[PDB]
Design a protein around this nucleic acid. Structure first.
Ligand SMILES: [Mg+2]
Ligand SMILES: [Mg+2]
Ligand SMILES: [Mg+2]
Ligand SMILES: [Mg+2]
Ligand SMILES: [Mg+2]
Ligand SMILES: [Mg+2]
Ligand SMILES: [Mg+2]
Ligand SMILES: [Mg+2]
Ligand SMILES: [Mg+2]
Ligand SMILES: [Mg+2]
Ligand SMILES: [Mg+2]
Ligand SMILES: [Mg+2]
Ligand SMILES: [Mg+2]
Ligand SMILES: [Mg+2]
Lengths: 129, 101, 81, 103, 32, 132, 99
RNA sequence: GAACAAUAGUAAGCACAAUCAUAGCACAUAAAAACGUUAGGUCAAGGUGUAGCUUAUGGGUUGGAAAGAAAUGGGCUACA
């Protein structure tokens, strides 16, 4: 394993918001367990919650030719877990998330939002034009 | 082989429509403007009327990609109802369950 | 494909109270920006979409911030009108 | 030979077959090394055009359109404009005939 | 010529550490 | 009378796979999904492609591996790689099995332009869930 | 409505990069039009169908290279053989009608 | 081919029932509902057995259709 250190002042993250979409509630439970257990070992200080489930239903005809009295209806459920992490470094995020994503199960998707901390841009600091 | 002749026809209309897309766009821009002179717009009118009309967008028909059926297709899977159901009911379609509530 | 269109989008949250603004400059910037300013929480927001790459949207959002600040301090004729 | 599954993935990734982690969806697309002011600000390409004519109305519109357009490179945006230069310049006749003198 | 070899579960050491056996993402072989 | 993906009651002697014995209304209740991918979740794209793709791999595996296929073929998509699991009956002499492993992986990988992983679990005889 | 209001409006828009001078609801469609991806260009349209010739021909060759096995075309085959055998085949082009 | 103070019935299977879903109960609804019946529906979803077409019952381009004397099915809006 090769580590390098570059002089530049690595990025801070106030809040790292990680959403996992899924079909089966089980998979998202065990994955929560895994993520929390990874984070507890890396000193990451995290929370988790369950956002409201989405259920999308729609309707098809039940026969090939004609009985329109008769339909079938189908569903897709989308279940959510969100891991909300606070006060992370740049590298910390890169690694932790790398470990998360690498192990992402096949039935699930993940949506990451970082909120990054930057002091002030250079042309605004206290010049005025 | 595409499954039907109708499919060949519409494959080709897709390729056409990708071909001329920017001619269409550009020309139609003048044509849809109230700021330009009418004089420009008449000539341009003749110009989009000029280009082959198998290359026009609305002449395109989504079909079931496997089965070719012109109606009954569900946009997301680009499948006919019959084929879709057929798949979903062996369980070969992920995340689709028969809906109860 | 790893291409997801939704990724481009960048947001800026900036608290106006943390800003070096003149009285005149603050008020002019409020009127200037409009809805992107929340008058209750003082959070100026900028969403950027327009450009294919994330870095670009970052640059442009920074650009907008910069610009709005530079323009809020400039008094003009019609302002006195 | 492959000593382990980790070995496997490793060779895939060096090779370019596996993805990079953590994912940035813009990986592999550099967009020409362009920057935001090479998209948003289109003054460059409007330099040859009548400055007070309705032509400016129109082309300022097209400007705004292509300024807001994520799905195109700089080279294509340019091509649109140049197509309009070519187009308007090709018809001098119709410009003169509509009640405005156009350059 | 028919081949029946007993599963790895037969040679498995009761205390043998698991991640040795299943390091990465896997199909679930019932044999191993 | 729903004929959908169902297997009729015989004189009672007919061997039936656990999957073919569990009727469509049973998906997600007892039976699982034969494929897995992101595409049908709320905010997601390109579901169609993974469907065409899936279909073609059903036909492909049925055709490359004649008479030796046990139960329907289990596809998983993980981070751009395919994991194709199969229950395969033991008919072939093992050499041929590995020939076709290499053959399949390579061919598919170069077709779908993404790395494919193949797994054969070999079974002495079709598992019987019911009758027999 | 005021002039101050108007000048602020202009200022804001020309800043954020939206429409500059006052323009009709009609003409704005041009802006909307380039600002988008034209319908025919969307990958969700032109790439709609999988190339069918590719799958068909690839599995076809792969049949004769001995690798793939097509039960459908084998059924087809055997049937065609048994139809030509009984004495009804597919006429040499041009021969059938006039005779 | 049953009688339970029982008289020739036993039987795993598939149905019903039971459980699942409608985010905790319960009920309700949803779903499910075999064997057969109606030679019920559909060779225009697709696929096929038998037959036919092959300088054409095949493949393309350009136009053209979907008019109301009425008769009736279902809706919508009213009659305040
Ligand atoms: Mg249409
Ligand atoms: Mg019913
Ligand atoms: Mg319950
Ligand atoms: Mg009940
Ligand atoms: Mg019912
Ligand atoms: Mg029941
Ligand atoms: Mg009949
Ligand atoms: Mg009848
Ligand atoms: Mg037919
Ligand atoms: Mg036939
Ligand atoms: Mg004809
Ligand atoms: Mg016609
Ligand atoms: Mg009447
Ligand atoms: Mg009414």
């Amino acid at each position: 394993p090769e580590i390098t250190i570059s002089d530049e002042p690595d990025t801070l993250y106030k809040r790292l918001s990680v959403l996992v979409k899924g079909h089966d509630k089980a998979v998202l439970d065990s994955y929560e367990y895994f993520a929390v257990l990874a984070a507890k070992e890396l000193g990451i200080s995290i929370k988790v919650h369950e956002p409201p489930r989405k259920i999308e239903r729609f309707t098809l005809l039940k026969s090939v030719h004609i009985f329109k009295k008769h339909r079938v209806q189908y569903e897709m459920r989308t279940l959510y877990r969100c891991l909300e992490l606070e006060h992370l470094t740049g590298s910390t995020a890169d690694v932790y998330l790398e470990y998360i994503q690498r192990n992402l199960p096949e039935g699930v998707a993940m949506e990451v939002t970082k909120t990054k901390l930057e002091q002030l841009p250079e042309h605004i600091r206290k010049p005025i034009w | 082989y595409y499954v039907d002749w109708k499919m060949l026809r519409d494959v080709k209309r897709r390729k056409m429509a990708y071909e001329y897309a920017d001619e269409r766009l550009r020309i139609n821009s003048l044509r849809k403007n109230t700021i330009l002179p009418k004089d420009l717009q008449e000539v341009a009118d003749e110009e989009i009327a000029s280009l082959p009309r198998d290359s026009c967008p609305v002449r395109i028909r989504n079909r079931c990609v496997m089965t070719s059926r012109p109606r009954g297709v569900k946009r997301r899977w680009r499948l006919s109802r019959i084929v879709f159901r057929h798949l979903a009911d062996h369980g070969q379609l992920s995340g689709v369950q028969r809906a109860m509530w | 494909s790893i291409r997801n269109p939704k990724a481009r989008v960048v947001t800026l949250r900036v608290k106006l109270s943390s800003l070096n603004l003149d009285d005149h400059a603050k008020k002019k910037l409020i009127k200037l920006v409009g809805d992107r300013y929340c008058k209750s929480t003082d959070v100026l927001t900028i969403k950027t979409d327009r450009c294919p790459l994330k870095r670009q949207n970052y640059d442009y959002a920074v650009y907008l911030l910069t610009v709005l600040y530079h323009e809020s301090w400039k008094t003009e004729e019609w302002e006195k009108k | 030979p492959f000593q382990n599954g980790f070995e496997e993935m490793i060779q895939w990734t060096k090779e370019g077959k596996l993805w990079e982690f953590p994912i940035n969806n813009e990986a592999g697309f550099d967009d020409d090394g362009s920057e935001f002011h090479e998209h948003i600000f289109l003054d460059k390409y409007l330099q040859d055009f009548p400055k007070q004519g309705p032509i400016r109305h129109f082309m300022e519109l097209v400007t705004c359109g292509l300024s807001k357009n994520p799905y195109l490179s700089v080279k294509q945006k340019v091509e649109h404009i140049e197509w309009f230069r070519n187009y308007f310049n090709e018809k001098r006749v119709i410009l003169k005939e509509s009640g405005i003198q156009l350059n | 010529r028919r081949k029946a070899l007993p599963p790895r579960t037969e040679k498995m050491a009761v205390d043998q550490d698991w991640p040795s056996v299943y390091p990465v993402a896997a199909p679930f072989k019932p044999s191993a | 009378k729903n004929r959908a993906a169902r297997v009729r009651v015989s004189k009672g002697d007919k061997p039936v796979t656990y999957e073919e014995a569990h009727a469509p209304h049973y998906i997600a209740h007892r039976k699982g999904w034969l494929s897995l991918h992101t595409g049908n979740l709320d905010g997601e794209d390109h579901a169609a492609e993974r469907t065409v793709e899936d279909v073609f791999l059903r036909k492909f595996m049925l055709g490359t591996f004649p008479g030796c296929l046990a139960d329907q073929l289990v596809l998983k998509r993980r981070a751009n790689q395919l994991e194709i699991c199969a229950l395969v009956l033991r008919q072939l002499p093992p050499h041929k099995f590995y020939f076709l492993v290499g053959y399949s992986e390579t061919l598919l990988s170069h077709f779908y332009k993404c790395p494919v992983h193949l797994h054969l679990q070999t079974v002495p005889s079709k598992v019987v869930y019911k009758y027999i | 409505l005021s002039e101050y209001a108007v000048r602020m409006s202009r200022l804001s828009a020309r800043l954020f990069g939206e429409v500059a001078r006052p323009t009709d609801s009609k003409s704005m469609k041009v802006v909307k039009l380039f600002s988008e991806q034209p319908l025919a260009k969307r990958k969700e349209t032109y790439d709609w169908y999988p190339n069918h010739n590719t799958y068909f021909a690839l599995m076809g060759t792969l049949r004769f290279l001995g690798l793939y096995r097509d039960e459908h075309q084998d059924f087809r085959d055997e049937q065609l053989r048994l139809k030509k055998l009984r004495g009804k085949g597919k006429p040499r082009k041009g021969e059938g009608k006039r005779a």
